[PDB]
Amino acid sequence: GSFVEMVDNLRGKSGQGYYVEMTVGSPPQTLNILVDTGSSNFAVGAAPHPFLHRYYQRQLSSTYRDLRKGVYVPYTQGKWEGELGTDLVSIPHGPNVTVRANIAAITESDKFFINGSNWEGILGLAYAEIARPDDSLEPFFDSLVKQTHVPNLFSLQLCGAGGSMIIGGIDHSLYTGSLWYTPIRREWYYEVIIVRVEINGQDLKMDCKEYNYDKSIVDSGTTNLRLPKKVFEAAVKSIKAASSTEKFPDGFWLGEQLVCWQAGTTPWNIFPVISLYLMGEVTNQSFRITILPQQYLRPVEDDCYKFAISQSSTGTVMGAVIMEGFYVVFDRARKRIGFAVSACHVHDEFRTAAVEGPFVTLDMEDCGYN
Ligand SMILES: Nc1nc2ccccc2nc1N1CCCC1
Numbered sequence: 001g002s003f004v005e006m007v008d009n010l011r012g013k014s015g016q017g018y019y020v021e022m023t024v025g026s027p028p029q030t031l032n033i034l035v036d037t038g039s040s041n042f043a044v045g046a047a048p049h050p051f052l053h054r055y056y057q058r059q060l061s062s063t064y065r066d067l068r069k070g071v072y073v074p075y076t077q078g079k080w081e082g083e084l085g086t087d088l089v090s091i092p093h094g095p096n097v098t099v100r101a102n103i104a105a106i107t108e109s110d111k112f113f114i115n116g117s118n119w120e121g122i123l124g125l126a127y128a129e130i131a132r133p134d135d136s137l138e139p140f141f142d143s144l145v146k147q148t149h150v151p152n153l154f155s156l157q158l159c160g161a162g163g164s165m166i167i168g169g170i171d172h173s174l175y176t177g178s179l180w181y182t183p184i185r186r187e188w189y190y191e192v193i194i195v196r197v198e199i200n201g202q203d204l205k206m207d208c209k210e211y212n213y214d215k216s217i218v219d220s221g222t223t224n225l226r227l228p229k230k231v232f233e234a235a236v237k238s239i240k241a242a243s244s245t246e247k248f249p250d251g252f253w254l255g256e257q258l259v260c261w262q263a264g265t266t267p268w269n270i271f272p273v274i275s276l277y278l279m280g281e282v283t284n285q286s287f288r289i290t291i292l293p294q295q296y297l298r299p300v301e302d303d304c305y306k307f308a309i310s311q312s313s314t315g316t317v318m319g320a321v322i323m324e325g326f327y328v329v330f331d332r333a334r335k336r337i338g339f340a341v342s343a344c345h346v347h348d349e350f351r352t353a354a355v356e357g358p359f360v361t362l363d364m365e366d367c368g369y370n
Contacts, residue, residue, distance in 0.1 A: 003166045007174070009093040010035065010163040011118075014299060015223045015306075018158055018320075019119040020165055023090045024103060025061030030054075030092075034122045035156070035165060037190055037330065038219030038317070040131040041073065042089075042140040043082060044121030046105035051113040054120055056105055063088045063100075071104055073132050078111035089140070095150050095167050101143040122221070125154065125330070129188035141332075152333035156220055159344040160324045161299055175327035175340035180287040180357050182278040184335045185368060189217035192337055194316060195286050195367045196277035197231065199238040206234060208367035215315040215369070218328065218337055222319035224255070225274075225296060226312035235274075235309065242272035252307055260304040268293050268348050276322075279364045280357065281336065286364065287357025289339050291325045294346040295353065325353035 011032075012018035019032040024044065031044055031054065046056040058064045067084035083105045090098045106112075106121070113120075128135040128142065145152050150168040157164040157174045164174055185191045194211040197204045213228050227235055236253055246267070251257040261267070271293035277286040297305040298321070308321045325345045329338030339355050347353060 001170050001172055003169050003171045005093055005096075006166045007164045007171065008162060009165055010158065012162070013117060014161060016114050016117045017119065017221055018163055020094075020123065021092050022123070023092060024056060025058075025087050026063040028090065029056060029060065031056065031121055032119045034119045034221060035125065036122050036219070036221030037125045037156075038217060038221045039122065039124035040126045040128060040139040041071075041104050041122070041124045041137070042101060043073075043080065043104035043106055043124075045109070045113065046082065047107050049109055049113055051115045051117070052120055056103070056121070058085065058087075058105055061087055067102075069133075071133050079108070080106050080110070080112045081108035082106040084137070091167070094165070095148065097144070097148045097150065099144050099147040101140045102137055126189050127187040153329070153331050155327060155329040155338075156323065157327050157342055157344055158220065158320060158323050159342070160295065160346045163344065170329055170338075173343070175343050177341045177355055179327075179329060179338040179340045180355055181281050181329075181331065181334075181336040181338045182287075183281065184332075184337060187335075189215065189219070190330065190337055191215050191217050193279040193364065193367050194276050195279055195361050195364050196288075197235070198275040198277075198288075199235065200242050200272040201275070202238060204231070204234050204238065206231065209369050211316060212367055213315060213369045216318065217315065218318045218323070220320065220323055222317045223298070223321065224308045224310045224317070224319050225321045226310050226317035226319065228315060229311050229313065231316070232309070232311045239272055239274075243270050245270055255307050255310050258300055258304045258306055260302040263303050266303050266305070269350065271297070273351065276318075277359060277361065278339070279367065282358070284360055284362060284364070285358040286361040287339075287355065288359065289322070289326060290354040290356070291322055292347055292351055292353055294348070295325050296321045326355065
């Protein structure tokens with residue numbers, strides 16, 4: 001399992017996602033595409049926009065095809081809108097293959113393209129269920145798999161402060177220890193089940209349904225770890241108490257105010273370690289993943305930091321803060337998500353992120369909410 005073409009094929013600014021090189025059309029038109037496992041449309045900019053600079057030019061592709069059908073994607077704090085079509089796609093530092101796929105050519109934007117982000121489009125890598133306009137618009141990865149011999153599998157190493165996407169394979173060099181897998185509960189988002197939460201080993205002692213209310217997803221297109229209101233409050237209460245030797249304003253905890261120490265003097269060790277126990281492959285087994293303050297304290301330009309754990313009303317989003325500690329294998333073929341300690345993860349001399357198991361956990365499928 002060696003994939004040296006694909007290693008280090010991701011780049012990205014802090015809090016502005018991780019993107020990848022893709023070409024579309026004939027002749028090839030290069031674009032930087034956000035890697036988003038929380039959506040299922042491959043959409044790209046196809047018109048002028050201030051924060052864009054390059055874009056898809058459909059009238060220059062001899063292989064473009066118009067599906068003569070619009071698509072409208074509203075969401076939490078914005079919208080994008082565009083015209084459906086198809087065209088040959090490739091990934092220069094990906095599998096050596098060209099495939100025809102659904103492309104959404106974006107024409108209206110609103111709080112979507114981010115200034116100085118250097119990505120021009122989005123590659124939704126999750127399931128048809130949540131594709132727009134409807135689940136019959138085949139997402140790119142499916143197309144890729146069905147048109148080639150590429151296994152139904154991708155893995156993501158994301159490094160805090162670049163990273164790798166391996167399509168079709170697990171690269172052992174990107175991580176150490178063992179891979180541990182958790183079931184994909186249902187195939188829309190990469191939904192999975194959390195059965196226990198610990199701050200420095202203290203249980204939140206919470207009815208585990210609260211952890212997945214009304215779902216727990218793995219989303220590379222979300223920066224923060226987002227937790228359900230109820231879980232969030234208890235988590236911050238516990239993190240507060242554990243780092244209480246130094247105190248911060250309410251505003252820091254709400255993800256607003258930065259906090260700064262002199263360069264190189266960051267007291268990582270006063271902040272607690274956060275562990276999520278995920279449902280295992282075998283009955284009555286969980287494994288845990290364990291992330292550091294280095295993961296949930298996001299650097300900003302003294303060394304300055306922004307708290308990267310926020311409230312949610314739509315359930316647990318396991319974002320980049322979580323993904324940055326782990327090689328995360330997206331094993332669609334066997335319906336499961338594999339975690340291993342990332343070889344590229346940020347940590348101090350004294351504490352590392354971790355992936356340990358097994359643990360005896362009874363009644364784990366009570367931990368999902370319906
Ligand atoms: N993963 C997400 N992708 C998006 C793409 C476009 C617009 C909004 C998006 N929101 C996402 N999140 C997953 C659940 C809520 C946030």
